[PDB]
């Protein structure tokens, strides 16, 4: 697999650039500085780590390294905590949009910068505690050979338990949040359509501006698309592991397929800046400013 490596490199460079661009935008332009965008910045950073770290670890583990059980389990599962943090932020954002759009009168005092701080900190902690189950002593170790004495080679499939990837990951810490996220979002959308359809039958300004509503709802859809693509990303991999696990002594997945879900899920962190540029005028204009500036500088 030559192409594969030059690939995971192309990824790292992309993800790093695009997300550094998002964070530089948010720092640079005051309009982007706000709770929603602190969670968005969390997403950016967690997707930068994958660029600088998770891909090199994706590239060592292919070549079958050998080391201490736990120090091996790190490089084995790291992108785990990243992915988890990505979910936590996505959900924080869905909820923030939910307060904003469903209960706009209490959003002012309810959602604050410092509280954003706290929820983010916490979410990172928990992204770790959950992120690597191995590190806490939960053990697939102790059951190549002559690799080493005090060193047991660490490769995902065997040194990574599939009784978790398909249970404490796919079933618990991914599908559930993703799902009540789909819920919160559909609730926002249906409700907003209801009250718009209502504002129509009663000439404005009945309660709040229709234009405003439609605008923040369009923005919510742009934000929910990010979730949709996240799902479209880790879903294939979790399907693979999913049915490969429920029939452990049944069949397994190829090289030429199985080596996708890794690439793909690794692609999940590349697209965000592009989705922003496409769906959101403030980012697009800022990226445009940063690039149109610091290029010809």
């Amino acid at each position: 697999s030559s192409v594969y490596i030059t690939v995971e490199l192309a990824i790292a460079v992309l993800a790093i650039l695009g997300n550094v661009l998002v964070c530089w935008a948010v720092w640079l332009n005051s309009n982007l500085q706000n709770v929603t965008n602190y969670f968005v910045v969390s997403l950016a950073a967690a997707d930068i780590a994958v660029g600088v770290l998770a891909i090199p670890f994706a590239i060592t583990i292919s070549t079958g390294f050998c080391a201490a059980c736990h120090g091996c389990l790190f490089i084995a599962c790291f992108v785990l905590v990243l992915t988890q943090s990505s979910i936590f932020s996505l959900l924080a954002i869905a909820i923030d949009r939910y307060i904003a759009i469903r209960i706009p009168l209490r959003y002012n005092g309810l959602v604050t910068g410092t509280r954003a701080k706290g929820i983010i900190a916490i979410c990172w902690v928990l992204s770790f505690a959950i992120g690597l189950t191995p590190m806490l002593g939960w053990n697939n170790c102790g059951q190549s050979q002559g690799c080493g004495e005090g060193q047991v080679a660490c490769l995902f499939e065997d040194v990574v338990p599939m009784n978790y990837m398909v249970y404490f990951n796919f079933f618990a810490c991914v599908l559930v949040p993703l799902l009540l996220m789909l819920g919160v979002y559909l609730r926002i959308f249906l409700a907003a359509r209801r009250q718009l359809k209502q504002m129509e039958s009663q000439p404005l300004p009945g309660e709040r501006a229709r234009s405003t509503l439609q605008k923040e709802v369009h923005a919510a859809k742009s934000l929910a698309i990010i979730v949709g693509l996240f799902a479209l990303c880790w879903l294939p991999l979790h399907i693979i592991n999913c049915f490969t696990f429920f029939c452990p002594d049944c069949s397994h997945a190829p090289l030429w397929l199985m080596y996708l879900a890794i690439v793909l899920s690794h692609t999940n962190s590349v697209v965000n800046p592009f989705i922003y540029a496409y769906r959101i005028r403030e980012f697009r204009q800022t990226f445009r400013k940063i690039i149109r500036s610091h290029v010809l500088r």
């Epitope: 309009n31 501006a209 405003t212 923040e216 923005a219 403030e282």
Partner: antibody
Framework: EVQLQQSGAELVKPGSSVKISCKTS????????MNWVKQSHGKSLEWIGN????????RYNQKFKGKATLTVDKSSSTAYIQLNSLTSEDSAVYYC?????????????????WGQGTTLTVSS | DIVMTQSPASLSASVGDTVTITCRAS??????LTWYQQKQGGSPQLLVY???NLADAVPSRFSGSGSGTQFSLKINRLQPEDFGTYYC?????????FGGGTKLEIKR
């Protein structure tokens, strides 16, 4: 149906202070920042500052720092601006406006509702 | 602090023709710019927000546009109800400021 009803015209000697009020009816007062604008000679507008009704927290334009003082009585849904050490140059019409807020990916801001305005005349 | 500069200061025009007002910012405010309409003896009314966005019930013949440092409001087939003074305001930053206004007068 939202309405910002400002206090009536004010005529005072230079050296004195004044408190103009804006009562809000038809929505939640604590949900939006209240702003004050000064219009001079029927033309030029200037942003004086704004106040968060919930916390009473304020941001002033530098030019009016120390001249204006913003305050809120949430009980009555009423916001006040008070002007101190009045001179003729303070003679103008003062508006309270209400700030709207939403997220388009940026923070979107506007003054959607304005008061009828209040005339202040400062002369000896 | 960021400074708005609006032109022309006054413009006379006839019902039915097209008019354009310009706001120019001393810095980069991106899209955060508001247009207000004031009728004689009235209070400024919200017209455009986010530089491109028509307020509720404002007629489609109104259009906002521009970005960064440069903005324009345009009225298409002028109606008699459209004469008055227009103002720009930037919402960028912690401290805000207005254009000097454009007075739109009837040509006879």
């Amino acid at each position: 149906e939202v309405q910002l009803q400002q206090s009536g015209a004010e005529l005072v000697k230079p050296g004195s202070s004044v408190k103009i009020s804006c009562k809000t009816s038809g929505d939640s007062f604590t949900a939006y920042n209240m702003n004050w604008v000064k219009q001079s000679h029927g033309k030029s507008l200037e942003w004086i500052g704004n106040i968060n009704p919930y916390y009473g927290s304020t941001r002033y334009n530098q030019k009016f720092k120390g001249k204006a003082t913003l305050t809120v009585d949430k009980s009555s849904s009423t916001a006040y601006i008070q002007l101190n050490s009045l001179t003729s140059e303070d003679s103008a019409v003062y508006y309270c406006a209400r700030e709207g807020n939403y997220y388009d990916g940026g923070s979107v801001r506007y003054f959607d509702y304005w008061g009828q305005g209040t005339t202040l005349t400062v002369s000896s | 602090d960021i400074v708005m500069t609006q032109s022309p200061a006054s413009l006379s025009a006839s019902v039915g023709d097209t008019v354009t007002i310009t706001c120019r910012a001393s810095e980069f405010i991106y899209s955060s710019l508001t247009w207000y309409q004031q009728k004689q003896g009235g209070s400024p009314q919200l017209l455009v927000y986010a530089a491109t966005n028509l307020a509720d019930a404002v007629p489609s013949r109104f259009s906002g546009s521009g970005s960064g440092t440069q903005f324009s409001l345009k009225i298409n087939r002028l109606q008699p109800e459209d004469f008055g003074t227009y103002y720009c305001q930037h919402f960028y930053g912690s401290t805000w400021a207005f254009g000097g206004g454009t007075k739109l007068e009837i040509k006879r």
